[PDB]
Design a protein around this ligand. Structure first.
Ligand SMILES: Cc1cc2nc3c(=O)[nH]c(=O)nc-3n(C[C@H](O)[C@H](O)[C@H](O)COP(=O)(O)OP(=O)(O)OC[C@H]3O[C@@H](n4cnc5c(N)ncnc54)[C@H](O)[C@@H]3O)c2cc1C
Ligand SMILES: Cc1cc2nc3c(=O)[nH]c(=O)nc-3n(C[C@H](O)[C@H](O)[C@H](O)COP(=O)(O)OP(=O)(O)OC[C@H]3O[C@@H](n4cnc5c(N)ncnc54)[C@H](O)[C@@H]3O)c2cc1C
Ligand SMILES: Cc1ncc(C[n+]2c([C@@](C)(O)OO)sc(CCOP(=O)(O)OP(=O)(O)O)c2C)c(N)n1
Ligand SMILES: Cc1ncc(C[n+]2c([C@@](C)(O)OO)sc(CCOP(=O)(O)OP(=O)(O)O)c2C)c(N)n1
Ligand SMILES: Cc1ncc(C[n+]2c([C@@](C)(O)OO)sc(CCOP(=O)(O)OP(=O)(O)O)c2C)c(N)n1
Ligand SMILES: COc1cc(C)nc(NC(=O)NS(=O)(=O)c2ccccc2OCCF)n1
Ligand SMILES: COc1cc(C)nc(NC(=O)NS(=O)(=O)c2ccccc2OCCF)n1
Ligand SMILES: [Mg+2]
Ligand SMILES: [Mg+2]
Ligand SMILES: [Mg+2]
Ligand SMILES: [Mg+2]
Ligand SMILES: [Mg+2]
Ligand SMILES: [Mg+2]
Ligand SMILES: [Mg+2]
Lengths: 582, 582, 287
């Protein structure tokens, strides 16, 4: 049973009830930054012997760290901020967690209840601000509600389609004395009654039947499969269907595998987008048919029967209309379909080697390619060397931009939750704090933040967090001195007319600005810069072998372009396969 | 007349119409950070020969810089961000501008109109998110509306009670060709019909009459008086009434003046709070009776006739019920009352020298005081030396915390808009970006960011902005290695139990962590650290005399406390005048 | 027009809702609180400091009483047609001003406000802010249940009365002594008046009768009362009005009196919307 630090008849502060509510959820780590409206919560945290606090240097760092914790572990991430300016600094993280379906519980202090609505000191209506960028939120109006609301928040954040839940706690409720009741029933009758049931054998056998009748099936795998790598891998054994993955699904099926078509979509491989373009059966498991993937919807999988299995009924038929649909956990659907495939194996005689051979011809004519100019370091090459020296077992977090795409293309993720990247919102500054959360959740792992120079500086203050918490976070900084992805679009569509994409100092144009090594130096983090491709392998090896945190500044020619590229709203026939800024 | 870069019959992109709309408003500076949804706006900016863009390193830096620009100049600040994660990074600045009544126009790119509502790439419903933390906002749904909406946004941001206005612009509207109509009438019939009229002589003479009937009048001056320093000063000549100022009103009446009671409220001077406590006439000009100032409302000015002049009818009677009220521009009310006072001067025979003498006794028994321990640098002393070496003529911006209060107490601001500080929301990380905006708006001024070590690191990335834009921003960093204000409350109310307020490295407890000098070094900004009080004067002098940016790391004992302190919700009889963390 | 309203007065506003103080008109002095307490406090001050104050406004009162004699509320009597103003005055007399009055919305509402002398508050039940037709009959039902011994009269218009005529069944079944004084002008009277003043008497769907039988009272409200077992009568000649109202009052239980009135009557005086005192209309009708 659970052991409380208080007697069952002993009144204690609401802040102490809230912390014990976290303890009763199995919480061991929080990311909490103190302020006036949350001082009581922070005092109660020091009284907890089972919950560790990682103090960020910015609440956006706190929420992004909670995301990295969640994405790398499957557990909910918990961040805590004070009222007013603390709460508003969470907003980008809440939106990011909602768009990527990341389970997250955010607790904000609030001004006393009687002060609400009066423009009080450090008051913002955070429940109103965040209603459209959270899965649910609460304003606690009585200390007796703390056990129930915390329980509901964790249940909502982690069940169904996961997402962020914000709990706003007025300071007077934190100080009120009460005796908690941990037996209160949750008040989610509508939500709980609309929870998907395990899929029926009726629907599952229709799918297995559709597979046997098809000649060109393609698996279309996304973020919803992160807990189904075993079931999915078994499914691929029994069917031999090639696997195309989204940015969010990377690693659900191993990238180094022969049946892997790698990533599809705007910057997906030519052969992955080819497969979807010419398929007759599209198995869309745990995906939401977003515009980065589909392009022009009418042309996406235009001659395929579309099977869509999603745990969110609101996603089924939202953009692309499926032929067959299953609303439920893809993990269960895979388990059920795997049994059918095992028994009726010899009756089905599944063989797609002719389709696979057609795709492997595309895989040989159009592989992912990069150019090497003299001794300049290709960013693609740097990530490939990191893959080798870490044996593809590192947890990878990124910023947003060209380096993000290259980290997606040129690292072979073997398991899900190695890949931590902001996909739906695409928020710069995510990589460094996310690596902080992933390292705390996986203390023995290799954690590398593959960051861009614009993204890295946005939350550079979290270097102090990495040092103080003694986290072995590695930073592989692909430094092209530009806002690279926006620069690439300037080259393609605006005649290379630069509009504020250069991040260096124009007074000293040929100097690396700023000097990221001194940012690491300021926080006592060893660092180095590498410029010549000949030095890169030993440089990365040094970063990995040096215990504790390390920053490697990898200088790269800025004229590189992420390829291939299907322009926004385009079709497969519009794919760009050559060119850069030279 | 205005000269357009386009022919009156020449169609141009909506992005070009939007930039010309800014030009037609007199905009010369914007703070714009590019992204996909705003690329068209940034391209159109490069075509403008009269608008400069200051590229921040974080959109929170962009909005805070726009605030500093506005607060230091009286002109609206303009920041521009892309959709999704760019827009959400503005949120703290919007809330901060609304709570402090700062005029501000924020432009966000948005996904194409047809994509809105579909969870598109980098889409957040920013108009929904910001509705409660902006004065007004817009979603442009037609390119023909751009002239009218921009005009309305600037009008709303700058008229009445100033505040932020957000304008959300879908990317397809930015690309659409049209011929603008600059003659469209605004659609603000309700707002414009409820605008306060110039105050009637009826109301103004009743006030002058109430002054002559009073023995203990106190002026209570706040942020609403920032454009009335001349009228207010003339008013004080004619009446001899002593002036108590809020945090937002500092400098409206000169601090070095003999009639100045300095700041009132929670950390106000004993004599300012004494005056309000025992006054019989309280002239509340441009104030909102916030809880930091009043304490327990029933006890605040409990035996005074309260005259409240506010331009926002919703503020009059919101917390404290006045006897007399004037809803209008305090600038006009002062002008009208000054005429009455000039004519009826000898008939009034105003003399409050007996009340003034009673207050000057309190001013001598309870002045602002600090202690000097050995050679340790008192933060109060450092600010006083900065006052002297700059002759009280520097523009000062701050973070939030103890250093903020000390910068309010120990610098004698001579004019309004020298003092740039986040008062209502109290957002850390404001000081450095605000100094950026103030320097761009006042190129010849001395600009000093008096920052705390927690506040300074939150937006340390803007050091790159200061270097690249070659701005002579000085940073006076009061480094106590703690979240000082929260530490002080731990000492007073939680038995000095530290709950995550220490910002240094516990592994090397007696080392200054992090090393802010290397943060400045990374961005090519000269820096120095001073530890001994004997070295402080020359150190500050060096910072001032060295051309361009400069960071001075001033080490201070952390056990200092901001005094005096009326505890939250307390009365004058609860004021704390002694003690610290020693 | 707000700028012209009390344009040379010091304005004291006592309201229990702080959001109302200074919302439209900016006061000089304000008290946010219960006006009952403010009156009690001010009454004590006035009692004690009575002889020190020497309050006398008889000169101002005399100036107003001159206006009260030159411009009283007036109505015209045409032959034997029943003036609605007269009907309400007769109801006042026969009930001694002690009846609870509820109304619909329109001309009859204004006349019930002008020509009945309410002696106590909560005798007057009328929809003022929203001005919802169909209020009078159900409101009378609630007032009678709350005041079983009172005289309750619904002074209703023919448009307003028919909107919730179904509550006649409620009045019968609950055996409530609700009286209905129906001022029947066969029109949506208040909208008709504005058509006369501002739209050249161009009728736009304000006639409530049957155009096929133009000179017939339509509908027959007496049969509505008959359907619900409620005694009823119609009066057309001013000579018959007093006995008709007396019958309604003396007959125990519910009763409907259909009072036919010339439709060309206008509510006077009238300050046009957004106007000033100098714009007041004091004469004219639809004739
Ligand atoms: C610069 C940039 C470029 C990008 N370009 C690309 C690109 O070329 N290709 C690409 O793929 N992405 C790209 N993206 C990422 C992108 O915008 C989206 O994040 C991604 O494409 C959508 O991932 P998803 O389809 O797997 O759905 P997710 O966002 O991962 O959501 C999971 C889906 O599965 C469902 N689900 C969740 N759990 C379960 C369960 N247990 N059972 C069943 N269903 C479940 C959810 O309801 C939801 O519909 C890019 C991002 C950036 C920032
Ligand atoms: C850590 C911390 C401690 C603080 N402690 C104190 C403290 O001890 N003392 C203190 O004073 N503050 C303190 N504050 C600041 C504080 O919370 C408020 O920002 C400040 O007290 C309110 O300023 P104000 O009363 O002048 O109203 P403002 O926020 O400045 O608003 C201006 C007011 O005047 C009106 N107005 C605007 N323009 C006009 C015009 N042309 N004519 C007429 N009216 C106009 C507006 O409607 C509004 O009502 C502290 C802040 C922090 C962060
Ligand atoms: C908070 C935030 N602000 C602005 C953004 C708009 N974007 C991008 C995009 C694609 O989302 O535009 O739609 S990518 C990008 C530039 C990335 O600079 P880098 O870190 O150096 O990486 P690289 O390897 O050089 O490319 C910007 C400015 C963003 N997403 N987040
Ligand atoms: C975005 C943000 N996050 C947290 C905040 C909560 N607060 C404070 C308060 C008073 O608003 O609490 O109500 S002040 C403060 C600590 C200030 O650290 P320093 O910069 O070093 O300055 P010092 O001279 O040492 O005191 C915190 C943590 C805040 N306002 N903004
Ligand atoms: C639900 C409802 N619908 C329509 C209304 C619009 N109005 C009116 C007004 C003033 O509110 O117009 O602004 S008054 C009126 C006509 C009243 O018909 P009567 O009952 O016969 O009374 P009378 O003695 O003849 O005048 C209408 C149609 C209304 N208020 N409520
Ligand atoms: C410089 O002022 C500080 C500083 C610190 C460190 N803490 C607080 N704490 C409170 O003021 N607590 S409060 O009485 O419940 C309160 C009353 C009214 C409005 C808000 C409010 O809380 C806001 C949270 F700060 N104030
Ligand atoms: C990596 O993808 C990138 C990168 C860059 C630099 N720019 C863009 N631009 C667009 O995609 N423009 S869009 O066709 O109108 C569009 C269509 C659908 C959804 C959103 C949307 O715009 C979002 C703003 F980016 N995309
Ligand atoms: Mg190579
Ligand atoms: Mg870059
Ligand atoms: Mg008076
Ligand atoms: Mg000294
Ligand atoms: Mg500090
Ligand atoms: Mg008569
Ligand atoms: Mg009628």
């Amino acid at each position: 049973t659970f052991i409380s630090r208080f007697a069952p008849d002993q009144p204690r502060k609401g802040a102490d009830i809230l912390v014990e509510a976290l303890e009763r959820q199995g919480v061991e780590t929080v990311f909490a930054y103190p302020g006036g409206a949350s001082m009581e919560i922070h005092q109660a945290l020091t009284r907890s012997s089972s919950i560790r606090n990682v103090l960020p240097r910015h609440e956006q760092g706190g929420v992004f760290a909670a995301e990295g914790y969640a994405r790398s572990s499957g557990k909910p991430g918990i961040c805590i901020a004070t009222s007013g300016p603390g709460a508003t600094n969470l907003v980008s993280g809440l939106a990011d967690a909602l768009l990527d379906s990341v389970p997250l519980v955010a607790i904000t202090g609030q001004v006393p209840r009687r002060m609400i609505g009066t423009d009080a000191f450090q008051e913002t209506p955070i429940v109103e601000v965040t209603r459209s960028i959270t899965k649910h939120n609460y304003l606690v109006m009585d200390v007796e509600d703390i056990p129930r609301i915390i329980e509901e928040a964790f249940f909502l954040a982690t069940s169904g389609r996961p997402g962020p839940v914000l709990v706003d706690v007025p300071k007077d409720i934190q100080q009120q004395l009460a005796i908690p009741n941990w037996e209160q029933a949750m008040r989610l009758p509508g939500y709980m009654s609309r929870m998907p049931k395990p899929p029926e054998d009726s629907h599952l056998e229709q799918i297995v039947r559709l597979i046997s009748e098809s000649k060109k099936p393609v698996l279309y795998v996304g973020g919803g499969c992160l807990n189904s790598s075993d079931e999915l891998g078994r499914f691929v054994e029994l069917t031999g269907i090639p696997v195309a993955s989204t940015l969010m699904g990377l690693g659900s099926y191993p990238c180094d595998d022969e049946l892997s078509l790698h990533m599809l979509g705007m910057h997906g491989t030519v052969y992955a987008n080819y497969a979807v373009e010419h398929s007759d059966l599209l198995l869309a498991f745990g995906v939401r048919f977003d515009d980065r993937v589909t392009g022009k919807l009418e042309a996406f999988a235009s001659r395929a029967k579309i099977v869509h299995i999603d745990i969110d009924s609101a996603e089924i038929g939202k953009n692309k209309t499926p032929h067959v649909s299953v609303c439920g956990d893809v993990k269960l659907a895979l388990q059920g379909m795997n049994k059918v495939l095992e028994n009726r194996a010899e009756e089905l005689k599944l063989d797609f080697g002719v389709w696979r051979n057609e795709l492997n011809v595309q895989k040989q004519k159009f592989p992912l390619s990069f150019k090497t100019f003299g001794e300049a370091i290709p960013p693609q090459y740097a990530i490939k060397v990191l893959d080798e020296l870490t044996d593809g077992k590192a947890i990878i977090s990124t910023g947003v931009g060209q380096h993000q795409m290259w980290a997606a293309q040129f690292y072979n993720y073997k398991k899900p939750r190695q890949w931590l990247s902001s996909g739906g919102l695409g928020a710069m500054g995510f990589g460094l704090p996310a690596a902080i959360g992933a390292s705390v959740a996986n203390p023995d792992a290799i954690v590398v933040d593959i960051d861009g120079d614009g993204s890295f500086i946005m939350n550079v203050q979290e270097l102090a967090t990495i040092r103080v918490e003694n986290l072995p976070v590695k930073v592989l900084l692909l430094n092209n001195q530009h806002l690279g992805m926006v620069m690439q679009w300037e080259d393609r569509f605006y005649k290379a007319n630069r509009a504020h994409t250069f991040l260096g100092d124009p007074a000293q144009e040929d100097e690396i600005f700023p000097n990221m090594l001194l940012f690491a130096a300021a926080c006592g983090i060893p660092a180095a810069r590498v410029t010549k491709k000949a030095d890169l392998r030993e440089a990365i090896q040094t970063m990995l072998d040096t215990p504790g945190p390390y920053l490697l500044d990898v200088i790269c020619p800025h004229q590189e372009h992420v390829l291939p590229m299907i322009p926004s709203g385009g079709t497969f026939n519009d794919v760009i396969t050559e060119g850069d800024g030279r």
